[PDB]
Enzyme design. Structure first.
Site, PDB file in Angstrom:
ATOM      1  N   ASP A 107       7.126  -6.441  -5.846  1.00  0.00           N
ATOM      2  CA  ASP A 107       5.667  -6.706  -5.995  1.00  0.00           C
ATOM      3  C   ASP A 107       4.990  -6.791  -4.608  1.00  0.00           C
ATOM      4  O   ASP A 107       3.867  -6.301  -4.508  1.00  0.00           O
ATOM      5  CB  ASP A 107       5.397  -7.996  -6.791  1.00  0.00           C
ATOM      6  CG  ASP A 107       5.343  -7.861  -8.305  1.00  0.00           C
ATOM      7  OD1 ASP A 107       5.656  -6.752  -8.838  1.00  0.00           O
ATOM      8  OD2 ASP A 107       4.928  -8.857  -8.961  1.00  0.00           O
TER       9      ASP A 107
ATOM     10  N   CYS B 108       1.941   6.332  -8.238  1.00  0.00           N
ATOM     11  CA  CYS B 108       2.174   4.871  -8.224  1.00  0.00           C
ATOM     12  C   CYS B 108       0.915   4.268  -8.855  1.00  0.00           C
ATOM     13  O   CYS B 108       0.389   4.880  -9.796  1.00  0.00           O
ATOM     14  CB  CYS B 108       2.544   4.391  -6.813  1.00  0.00           C
ATOM     15  SG  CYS B 108       1.493   5.024  -5.448  1.00  0.00           S
ATOM     16  N   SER B 109       0.312   3.228  -8.309  1.00  0.00           N
ATOM     17  CA  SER B 109      -1.007   2.823  -8.826  1.00  0.00           C
ATOM     18  C   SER B 109      -2.128   3.699  -8.252  1.00  0.00           C
ATOM     19  O   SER B 109      -2.895   4.254  -9.042  1.00  0.00           O
ATOM     20  CB  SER B 109      -1.306   1.325  -8.604  1.00  0.00           C
ATOM     21  OG  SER B 109      -2.339   0.953  -9.535  1.00  0.00           O
ATOM     22  N   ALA B 110      -2.295   3.755  -6.922  1.00  0.00           N
ATOM     23  CA  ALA B 110      -3.383   4.584  -6.327  1.00  0.00           C
ATOM     24  C   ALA B 110      -2.917   6.026  -6.042  1.00  0.00           C
ATOM     25  O   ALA B 110      -3.791   6.898  -5.820  1.00  0.00           O
ATOM     26  CB  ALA B 110      -3.903   3.907  -5.068  1.00  0.00           C
ATOM     27  N   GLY B 111      -1.619   6.267  -6.000  1.00  0.00           N
ATOM     28  CA  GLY B 111      -1.043   7.585  -5.647  1.00  0.00           C
ATOM     29  C   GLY B 111      -1.134   7.916  -4.153  1.00  0.00           C
ATOM     30  O   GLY B 111      -1.235   9.113  -3.829  1.00  0.00           O
ATOM     31  N   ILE B 112      -1.037   6.937  -3.263  1.00  0.00           N
ATOM     32  CA  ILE B 112      -1.039   7.216  -1.789  1.00  0.00           C
ATOM     33  C   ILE B 112       0.055   6.459  -1.047  1.00  0.00           C
ATOM     34  O   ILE B 112       0.493   6.972   0.013  1.00  0.00           O
ATOM     35  CB  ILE B 112      -2.436   6.957  -1.178  1.00  0.00           C
ATOM     36  CG1 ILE B 112      -2.910   5.516  -1.361  1.00  0.00           C
ATOM     37  CG2 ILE B 112      -3.439   7.908  -1.771  1.00  0.00           C
ATOM     38  CD1 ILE B 112      -4.219   5.189  -0.647  1.00  0.00           C
ATOM     39  N   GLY B 113       0.448   5.259  -1.486  1.00  0.00           N
ATOM     40  CA  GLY B 113       1.387   4.402  -0.741  1.00  0.00           C
ATOM     41  C   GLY B 113       2.854   4.713  -1.001  1.00  0.00           C
ATOM     42  O   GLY B 113       3.458   5.475  -0.218  1.00  0.00           O
ATOM     43  N   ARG B 114       3.437   4.148  -2.065  1.00  0.00           N
ATOM     44  CA  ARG B 114       4.814   4.504  -2.506  1.00  0.00           C
ATOM     45  C   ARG B 114       4.929   6.022  -2.687  1.00  0.00           C
ATOM     46  O   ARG B 114       5.972   6.595  -2.271  1.00  0.00           O
ATOM     47  CB  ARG B 114       5.167   3.770  -3.797  1.00  0.00           C
ATOM     48  CG  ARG B 114       5.089   2.255  -3.651  1.00  0.00           C
ATOM     49  CD  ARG B 114       5.339   1.529  -4.942  1.00  0.00           C
ATOM     50  NE  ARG B 114       4.899   0.157  -4.856  1.00  0.00           N
ATOM     51  CZ  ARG B 114       4.910  -0.712  -5.878  1.00  0.00           C
ATOM     52  NH1 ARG B 114       5.334  -0.335  -7.083  1.00  0.00           N
ATOM     53  NH2 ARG B 114       4.501  -1.961  -5.670  1.00  0.00           N
ATOM     54  N   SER B 115       3.938   6.655  -3.298  1.00  0.00           N
ATOM     55  CA  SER B 115       3.907   8.123  -3.535  1.00  0.00           C
ATOM     56  C   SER B 115       4.009   8.878  -2.206  1.00  0.00           C
ATOM     57  O   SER B 115       4.736   9.912  -2.138  1.00  0.00           O
ATOM     58  CB  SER B 115       2.628   8.516  -4.276  1.00  0.00           C
ATOM     59  OG  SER B 115       2.609   8.032  -5.629  1.00  0.00           O
TER      60      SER B 115
ATOM     61  N   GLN C 264       0.275   3.302   3.211  1.00  0.00           N
ATOM     62  CA  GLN C 264      -0.868   2.324   3.127  1.00  0.00           C
ATOM     63  C   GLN C 264      -0.714   1.187   4.152  1.00  0.00           C
ATOM     64  O   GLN C 264      -1.737   0.497   4.408  1.00  0.00           O
ATOM     65  CB  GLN C 264      -0.974   1.718   1.716  1.00  0.00           C
ATOM     66  CG  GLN C 264      -1.749   2.573   0.737  1.00  0.00           C
ATOM     67  CD  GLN C 264      -1.876   1.887  -0.611  1.00  0.00           C
ATOM     68  OE1 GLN C 264      -0.909   1.753  -1.365  1.00  0.00           O
ATOM     69  NE2 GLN C 264      -3.074   1.424  -0.916  1.00  0.00           N
TER      70      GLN C 264
END
Ligand SMILES: O=C(O)c1ccc(Cc2cccs2)cc1
EC number: 3.1.3.48
Length: 284
Positions: A181, A215-222, A262
């Site tokens: 998290d 992911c949620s926004a599609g920029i960090g983990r992605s 991010q």
């Protein structure tokens, strides 16, 4: 290992925040005018994360062709990825339309539906074989075929039917379920294992459309997933592996979607994953 030297130099000097801000400063800025039209407000999860007009995925319909999704085309590595937000209650039908129209074989999901006590994306796939999902707005049917649950990830086989033509395709769902998290994983071993599993499926290969990653926004983990994959492929291909510059690959990818990676901790984790993914390819 040079990247490993650059790594130990930044760690000993504690300059991760300074390297990260330099990338933010040099990153491309392109227009996102379609994303900001009033008709598209309920198609965006986050007001500050939009696809550029030049690289956005277009839906094949005359009504409204808009989805928050970008095509990342890596010319030297010969890999393409679609990066997208976690689907919203009113964009689940658009999401599966995109998978169908782009001829994708795989979907890569790097988040849980609930994290930090809030919903990060819609429940967009069926949880039981005998309870299929119909998307009336795009005329698609989605059925769970099988589910394989492991300690760090779950793989699902899904059947997607175009109800207009009665064609069907098998889609593989790769769900990384243990990203914490807060912050980033302590070791990249389970993330690299997961990356290899996606590669072994054929989902990243040129005989299919691009993999869909979210992911949620599609920029960090992605961002971390496609950056690690591309850097390891380039080390395999070039005469001088030492020449792969992770900061320059990230800036190339940011020409296609804003904000990829991010935090300074996500940047440090991407270095660790590439260095370890190389160390094991140095002797498996
Ligand atoms: O930076 C280096 O010194 C270095 C990096 C990779 C390799 C060998 C590899 C090639 C492809 C994946 S790992 C050798 C030396």
């Amino acid at each position: 290992m040079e990247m490993e030297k650059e790594f130990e130099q930044i760690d000993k000097s504690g300059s991760w925040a300074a390297i990260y801000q330099d990338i933010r400063h040099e990153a491309s800025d392109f227009p996102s005018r379609v994303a900001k039209l009033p008709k598209n407000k309920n198609r965006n999860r986050y007001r500050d994360v939009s696809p550029f007009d030049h690289s956005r995925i277009k839906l094949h319909q005359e009504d409204n062709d808009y989805i928050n999704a970008s095509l990342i085309k890596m010319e030297e590595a010969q890999r393409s990825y679609i990066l997208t937000q976690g689907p919203l209650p009113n964009t689940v039908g658009h999401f599966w339309e995109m998978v169908w129209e782009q001829k994708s074989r795989g979907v890569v999901m790097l988040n849980r539906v609930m994290e930090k006590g809030s919903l990060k994306c819609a429940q967009y796939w069926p949880q039981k074989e005998e309870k299929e999902m119909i998307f009336e707005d795009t005329n698609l049917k989605l059925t769970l075929i099988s589910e394989d649950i492991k300690s760090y990830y779950t793989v699902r086989q899904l059947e997607l039917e175009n109800l207009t033509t009665q064609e069907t395709r098998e889609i593989l769902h790769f769900h990384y379920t243990t990203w914490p998290d807060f912050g980033v994983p302590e070791s990249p071993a389970s993330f690299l294992n997961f990356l290899f599993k996606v590669r072994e499926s054929g989902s990243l290969s040129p005989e299919h459309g691009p993999v869909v990653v979210h992911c949620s926004a599609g920029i960090g983990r992605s961002g971390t997933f496609c950056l690690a994959d591309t850097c390891l492929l380039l080390m395999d291909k070039r005469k001088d592996p030492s020449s792969v510059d992770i900061k320059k690959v990230l800036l190339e990818m940011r020409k296609f979607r804003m904000g990829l990676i991010q935090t300074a901790d996500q940047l440090r984790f991407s270095y660790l994953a590439v260095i370890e993914g190389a160390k094991f390819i140095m002797g498996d």
